[PDB]
Amino acid sequence: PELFLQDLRSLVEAARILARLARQRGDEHALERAARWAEQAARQAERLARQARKEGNLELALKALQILVNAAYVLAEIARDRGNEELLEYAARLAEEAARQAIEIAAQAMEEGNFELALEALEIINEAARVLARIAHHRGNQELLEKAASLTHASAALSRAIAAILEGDVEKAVRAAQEAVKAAKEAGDNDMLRAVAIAALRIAKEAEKQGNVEVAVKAARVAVEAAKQAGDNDVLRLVSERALSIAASSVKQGNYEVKEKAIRVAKEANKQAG
Amino acid sequence: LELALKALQILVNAAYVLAEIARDRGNEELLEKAARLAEEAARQAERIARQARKEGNLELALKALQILVNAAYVLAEIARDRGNEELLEYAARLAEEAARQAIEIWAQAMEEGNQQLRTKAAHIILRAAEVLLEIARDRGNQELLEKAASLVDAVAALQQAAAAILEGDVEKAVRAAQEAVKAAKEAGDNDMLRAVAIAALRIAKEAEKQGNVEVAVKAARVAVEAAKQAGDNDVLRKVAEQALRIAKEAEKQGNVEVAVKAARVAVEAAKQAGDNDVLRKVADQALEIAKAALEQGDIDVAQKAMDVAVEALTQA
Amino acid sequence: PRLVLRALENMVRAAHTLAEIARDNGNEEWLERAARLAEEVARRAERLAREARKEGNLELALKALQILVNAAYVLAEIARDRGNEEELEYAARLAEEAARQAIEIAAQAMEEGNLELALKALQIIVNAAYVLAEIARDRGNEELLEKAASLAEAAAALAEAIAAILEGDVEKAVRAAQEAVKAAKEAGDNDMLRAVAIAALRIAKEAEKQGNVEVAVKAARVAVEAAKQAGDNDVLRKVAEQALRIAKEAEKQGNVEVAVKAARVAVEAAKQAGDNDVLRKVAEQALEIAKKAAEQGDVGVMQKAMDVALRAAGQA
């Protein structure tokens, strides 16, 4: 199967070269060839990318999303010099739902603790943010550029939090999570907020694994903040469950104040869930 | 063995950095030294590629070509501010010979069915064309634009055809192949046409397994269009064997009209090859086709079959 | 380990995107954010790189250096458009220090005999030279520009020498090494000189396997030429031990002229080092060389063996 992506890449490269050549040598049918080749390759990639989530090979899926971003760069190059906004709008829609789908993949990877895939999906997100910014630079949307700065900020924050978790540097992780929830507030996207909450959950799970219940309460206080801003009841349920983990762990550590905080956090999560 | 390519890549990268460092400064001696570093690396890489091709490790060979293409890119980047054409004259000729060798590698990979080399070789050829295009962008040679564009769109067709082969879509395969010969014939590159023809054999081999002889003859009609330029006698005999096999399948299907068109392709090739054993086999097959056309009462097809049979047999 | 490298690299890649976006928009605050992120990564990556060498895994270490070089590239891209000298100074310091550590890796790698790691480190060094030069041009400092260029040339010669070490042409290796000492002596970089000497030692070890003591001495003549600039006492000791090993083989070959030249190198090095055990071991062998020069009846060679042994002993 995998060779499909390599061939798609080659067709994208051919399109890139043809576009480069066409900026030297005048032929609108070179532009039309390259656009048709590229769009068809992108749709072929999209079919595979949709299939890959059913197949569960997320590695091939995020590789296909990298192809989509790389193709989107070439599509944007063609479109911006050809001077057509509808093709930019198409490329933008392609990139936007691709990146949103990457955010879903990243949430699964962080739930698994399969941080390998999370870092790679975050890379796809970075490169998508690059391509989105290139499009926005020609459309004039300062709002999208602020969102790109926010998206790159948030993906960096997720990366930093992941690094602190892999290191076990949990106070720095809690500090980084406090930065991350502000970055999510800058972004204003519920799916990013979900990914950040899933990170905050996984962060608290590491503190529970350590038995550092007070660090876990700090992590949970961020997690429930993210979940409260997101409004997702399944996240709020998972947060309430983890808060009861922390509460039981706090009684196991023999401290009533950390129990009291953990119960108040569980009750905040329950109050938002209704 | 392998480490030499890694070192050479580092040498080319070092030359690139040296050239970039020198670029803003009045020191053509640094540029000359960088060019000497690049030339030695290129001479090493060509010698390695020659030997690796003899040994049959195509991955080492194509990686050496990748390095050489990067070296050509560096040589052009040196040559521009130097105002020197002779460097470009070396680089373009070297890049053309590299592209030829990469196309020959691509043909061997297609013949052997090694998709894994095919992708790599395609990327290499595409990069080679990009470097030729940078050279053309500076130098203004319009023929090099035609060469580059046609090479690239021909690789894109070759890739599309390989994708169609993996998908089993013989109609897509024909659609692509028709454009592939269109590009390659406008280029006039007989080695590109050879690679196209070798791919067309693989198209025919799978088209028989699919059993759609009506599409397969359109593919064979493209195959001879290229093969008639290239003139490689063993390739022509291989093509003729495939055309006869296609005719045998068309008889099993009872489609004598497609069988006669398959013979019309077969004679066009056999008339170049001159192989009397092909002429004998063509006449024998044509008589079986005439027998089928008689049995069907398709006598316009029978007379067309025997017109082609006479046209073939008269070459003896 | 592995994940943290990936993550920090991704944090640099994120800073690279953020800097692109910020420069496209013309915004300041996003650069300030990026700079804070990049500095935090630089501080973390320095720790990681220092720890990785203490763990003995040079590959993890050199990858961490490549992260630092990516960070330096981003920091420079920010700083040179930001327009501040202290930022450019800090970036230059970071890149230079990373290059020092990279050469320390390269020295250790060649001393162990893993050219693959050394080649990787040379790519890191080449990258650092590019970054340093881009800083130095935009800052305006010809000394650092010349330093970058000369370092890059010396790196290129070292890469060529590594290629020659793979190939086994010891004359080519010496030809490269002559240019390598030329660049290194013009640069005055202690670690570059150390690296050249270590390479020359392994060149000599291969020349001994081949039995080519003559070219081994030519390599050693470069080795002392470099070592005499730098005073690496243990490298001088290794050079002297090699010179005695070479002299013992030259005695076994009966080439007392090459043996006396090997002693002539050994005393030149020992005169810098002042190591009494080396001096006495050298003089001990120098009388074996004089003994064989007398057995051959070579008057001028025995007069040289006299002159060397006596000058070696005369203040030891």
Author numbering:
A (entry chain d): 1 to 274
B (entry chain D), C (entry chain N): 1 to 316
Which of the paper's sentences describe this entry?
We used this approach to obtain an initial 30-subunit assembly with pseudo-D5 symmetry, and then generated an additional 15 variants in which we controllably altered the size and morphology of the bifaceted nanoparticles by designing de novo extensions to one of the subunits. A previously designed interface between the A and B chains drives assembly of the heterotrimers into the 15-subunit substructure with five-fold rotational symmetry, leaving the C-terminal end of the C subunits free for the design of an additional interface. We docked two full-length CrownC5-1 assemblies against each other by sampling rotation and translation along the five-fold axis to generate 30-subunit assemblies with D5 symmetry.
The method centers on docking pseudosymmetric heterooligomeric building blocks in architectures with dihedral symmetry and designing an asymmetric protein-protein interface between them.
